[PDB]
């Protein structure tokens, strides 16, 4: 009855919009960037190899002051390094050692970790007491953690694989937002320069827009055909990258509403685990699977020099705040500095 | 380098030596991974052999067991199946009294777990350890329904020994490329303190195993 | 956080006596330890200092072949031994805690101190003036210089400043030069190149009187330098 009713109603409106994106295509980014000049060859080094860990690397994320870092594995470590001297200043033991995510705080006084326990913790990192201590356990969801980001030192944003983002207050314990769009598993998360809006990727094949303060969707993007794993913004903020196991990177666009341009080659075949961009925004690394790392020229869609030296699946990658450098992961148990 | 640098390289040092430390005792533990259906009998099993995943530990001759549940997790397994790879057995829980009843009946649900558990591209060798449980409502109730609701193509005699061989054998042939992985089986009952000899002589071999291939010969 | 020695006394010459610390209140083991005297009407001297893992020992010239220092991790003492007491050991004995790692600040707390009587190459820090007359409300500098350049290689210049109020042990003011401690007013600020530096007080209370200390950590035997008085 009313129920097909409402059901042709919402068919009706999907056309709507296809056709309404489809008459803001006038022409396409190949088309625009076809007269420049293109980067010729990236010849990349490794100059530090960061040992330690006795299993699998799962994640790591890069300090504001582009000398610190902290790395997560399955060894129920955690540990923070020193890249310029490769000399370690704190290990941290997990109550839980299946951990698939970490942070690192702004200001440099925090950082998160989670996983399969279904809880965030907050480890506070200057103490009157020399040792590291926990701060708040944050319990509320139903699924593994898959990502977590600071806002500030109150503030954190969680993704989780029982189809729901949160808005956490550390001091009080509680969510204040809790963000319910998606139909499956939420892999990845990525926030503004201006932290006032992020994006999520889901297994569902769709990226989701939101708004921090009024707790509500934006935009919905689909293209791909399998699930997403990886996602990244634009230095500006108008504009952010997507990785998935179907092979394929792709890049979308927010005031247009659609779809730029795909990364993809025929030698290719296996998924993407990882996307970064470089500081000017005109290089793109992706991390794959078959144990290396592809470099791509964003404005024209070619491939302009590869990573290799790791002997397992690369995990995350990352690029610094001035940058000077990427750092790569692996299930090898290594970290490597390439510049 | 200065004093301090000197000092803080002393702080790594100790640090690495710590971490060396925790991996050696690690690295010298049977872990296990526990899978079943909710009714299919598991606590019986964790009581007798003693939100999130669970974990349970003890010691038995000289070895230090960690017993991994993970029937809390309802999501897609295919995203965290991944981090098991390296695990020494898993067991595989399944009641036969429940032929007759119905959640789709519920045999046919966990051979479907079964075949997908068996298969996969991380446990291409490693081996399983298989529980039948419950066996007196079986014994009880095999006189009054008949099997043949359960395999409408059993064309055999309706006792106990019989039926479970049956049922053994449908379970084992489930088993693409059995030449590369082992399989044990194993009949318990609610009042039986036998199974954690059962556990510990298949581990055994796969310790025998891993020790010859560090040493070279595999 | 607390530390407190003792010991302590009066002995005559020749005599052989040792001083005890325990700890409360932080992670004893992850530490490295100093023992600090100021002689009766003096300024500060370094004597020794242990590392944490006690693989590294240091003495100065004054005292080696006669002191010796050790700890003892799980009772939290740590101890120092004296042997040949001559007439110039007469002083007051502070320990003092400090941990070494990027972005640490070394030096941040000081114990009480114990008085023992007895019967009766380096780099030279230079403090040119003394017992400065100041009114509240106004603004202070203070100069100090060095013998040769503190400026490492790697970017880094290890001055540090202390504060010493009648009564009382010394506080920590600014560990690497120009960066300010925890708890401390934002008053006070400190700049400086090369060999020359310098520490200003903008307005100035009625508690931050008394005596400020100069000090280098670029290499041992850690010398320090005499004090200005600031007076009312």
């Known amino acids: 009855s009313e129920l097909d009713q409402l059901r042709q109603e919402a068919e009706q409106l999907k056309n709507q919009i296809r056709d309404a994106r489809k008459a803001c295509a006038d022409a396409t980014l190949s088309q625009i960037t076809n007269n420049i000049d293109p980067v010729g060859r990236i010849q990349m080094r490794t100059r530090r190899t960061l040992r330690g860990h006795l299993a699998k690397i799962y994640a790591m994320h890069w300090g504001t002051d582009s000398r610190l870092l902290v790395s997560a594995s399955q060894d129920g470590k955690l540990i923070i390094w020193d890249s310029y001297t490769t000399n370690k200043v704190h290990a941290i033991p997990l109550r839980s050692s299946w951990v698939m995510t970490c942070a690192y705080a702004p200001s440099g006084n925090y950082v998160a970790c989670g996983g399969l326990d279904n809880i965030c913790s907050i480890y506070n990192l200057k103490t009157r007491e020399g040792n590291v201590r926990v701060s708040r356990e944050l319990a509320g969801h139903t699924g593994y953690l898959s990502c977590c980001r600071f806002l500030d030192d109150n503030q954190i944003v969680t993704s989780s694989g029982d189809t729901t983002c949160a808005l956490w207050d550390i001091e009080t314990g509680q969510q204040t937002t809790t963000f319910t769009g998606h139909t499956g598993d939420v892999m990845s998360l990525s926030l503004a320069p201006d932290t006032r809006l992020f994006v999520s990727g889901a297994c569902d094949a769709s990226a989701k827009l939101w708004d921090v303060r009024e707790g509500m969707c934006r935009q919905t993007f689909t293209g791909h055909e399998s699930d997403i794993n990886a996602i990244c913004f634009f230095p500006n903020g108008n504009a952010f990258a997507t990785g998935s196991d179907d092979a394929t990177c792709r890049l979308f666009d927010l005031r247009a509403d659609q779809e730029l341009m795909t990364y993809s080659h025929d030698n290719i075949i296996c998924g993407i685990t990882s996307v970064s961009f470089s500081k000017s925004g005109r290089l793109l690394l992706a991390g794959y699977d078959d144990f290396n790392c592809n470099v791509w020229d964003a404005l024209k869609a070619d491939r302009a020099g590869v990573l290799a030296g790791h002997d397992n699946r690369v995990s995350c990658l990352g690029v610094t705040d001035d940058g000077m450098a990427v750092a790569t992961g692996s299930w090898d148990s290594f970290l490597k500095i390439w510049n | 380098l200065s004093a301090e640098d000197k000092a803080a390289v002393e702080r790594s040092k100790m640090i690495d030596r710590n971490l060396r430390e925790d991996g050696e005792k690690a690295a010298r533990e049977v872990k296990l991974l526990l899978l079943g259906a909710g009714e299919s009998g598991k606590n019986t099993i964790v009581k007798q052999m003693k939100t999130g995943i669970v974990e349970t530990h003890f010691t038995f001759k000289d070895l230090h067991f960690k017993m991994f549940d993970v029937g809390a997790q309802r999501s897609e397994r295919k995203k965290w199946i991944h981090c098991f790879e390296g695990v020494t057995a898993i067991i595989f829980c399944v009641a036969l009294s429940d032929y007759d009843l119905v959640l789709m009946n519920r045999m046919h649900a966990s051979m479907k777990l079964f075949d997908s558990i068996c298969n996969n591209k991380w446990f291409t060798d490693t081996s399983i350890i298989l529980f039948l449980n419950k066996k007196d409502l079986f014994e009880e109730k095999i006189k009054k329904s008949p099997l043949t609701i359960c395999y409408p193509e059993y064309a055999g005699s309706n006792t106990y020994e019989e039926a479970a061989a049956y049922i053994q054998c449908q379970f084992e042939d489930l088993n693409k490329r059995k030449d590369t992985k082992e399989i044990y089986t194993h009949f318990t009952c609610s009042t039986d303190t036998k199974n954690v000899q059962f556990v510990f002589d298949a581990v055994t071999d796969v310790i025998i195993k891993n020790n010859l291939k560090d040493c070279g010969l595999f | 956080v607390q530390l407190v020695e003792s010991g302590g006394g009066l002995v005559q010459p020749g005599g052989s006596r040792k001083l005890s610390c325990s700890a409360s209140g932080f992670a004893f083991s992850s530490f490295g330890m100093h023992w600090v005297r100021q002689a009766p009407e003096k300024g500060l001297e370094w004597v020794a200092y242990?590392?944490?893992?006690?693989?590294?020992?240091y003495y100065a010239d004054t005292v080696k072949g006669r002191f010796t220092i050790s700890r003892d991790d799980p009772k939290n003492t740590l101890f120092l031994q004296m042997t040949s007491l001559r007439s110039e050991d007469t002083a007051m004995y502070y320990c003092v805690r400090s941990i070494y790692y990027y972005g640490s600040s070394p030096f941040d707390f000081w114990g009480q101190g114990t008085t023992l009587t007895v019967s009766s190459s380096d780099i030279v820090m230079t403090q040119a003036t003394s017992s400065v007359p100041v009114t509240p409300g106004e603004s202070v500098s203070i100069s100090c210089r060095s013998s040769?350049?503190?400026?490492?290689?790697?970017?880094?210049?290890?001055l540090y400043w202390f504060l010493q109020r009648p009564g009382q042990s010394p506080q920590l003011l600014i560990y690497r030069m120009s960066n300010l401690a925890s708890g401390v007013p934002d008053r006070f600020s400190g700049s400086g190149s090369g060999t020359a530096f310098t520490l200003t007080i903008s307005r100035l209370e009625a508690e931050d009187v008394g005596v400020y200390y100069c000090?280098?950590?670029?290499?041992?035997?850690?010398?320090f330098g005499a004090g200005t008085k600031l007076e009312l």
């Open positions: 040769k350049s503190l400026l490492h290689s790697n970017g880094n210049t290890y």
């Open positions: 242990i590392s944490s893992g006690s693989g590294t020992i």
């Open positions: 000090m280098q950590h670029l290499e041992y035997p850690l010398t």
